Amino acid sequence: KPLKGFVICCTSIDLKQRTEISTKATKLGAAYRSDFTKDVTHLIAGDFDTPKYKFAAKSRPDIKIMSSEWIPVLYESWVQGEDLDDGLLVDKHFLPTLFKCRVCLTNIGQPERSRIENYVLKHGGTFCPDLTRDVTHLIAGTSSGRKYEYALKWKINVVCVEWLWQSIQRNAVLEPQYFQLD
């Protein structure tokens, strides 16, 4: 049982895939949890914007946040008879740090703007030069201007750039209230 000792929980995984992941994980030797219990070791996440993800990032940084592809790929490799690496593909299927983030900026000059786009791309997010209603985070130098006012109207998170640096350090999207502008 390669996943002996692993305890897997899901968040923002569709019911069909959740069933697939639970069964394959259990057949690989893992335990499966519907609720986020203390013994969970891996959180398979389809989104950052859920109570379970927020709980992991805030209170359980020991827990590994995984993409939905991890268990299907590991399972197939295992039943195909291939010799599993001792890491069990975990290092290849961490959820990208800024997965599903769509990051826009305002009131920050060059080259800082160019560097921010570079880090958003390297850490798995989408960079948005124009504010749209689907942006998830507006990094603002000041709480003023057109992008900022439409972010308020569109209910978009407005954060200071430390949100980006600390999320990158943590390998998880941190919550926005911790990075609200003064």
Binding site: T106, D130, T132, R146, K147, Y150
Partner: peptide, 9 residues
């Protein structure tokens, strides 16, 4: 009343 707020020129 806009689709986007364009990147600051």
């Amino acid at each position: 009343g806009v689709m986007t707020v364009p990147n600051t020129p």
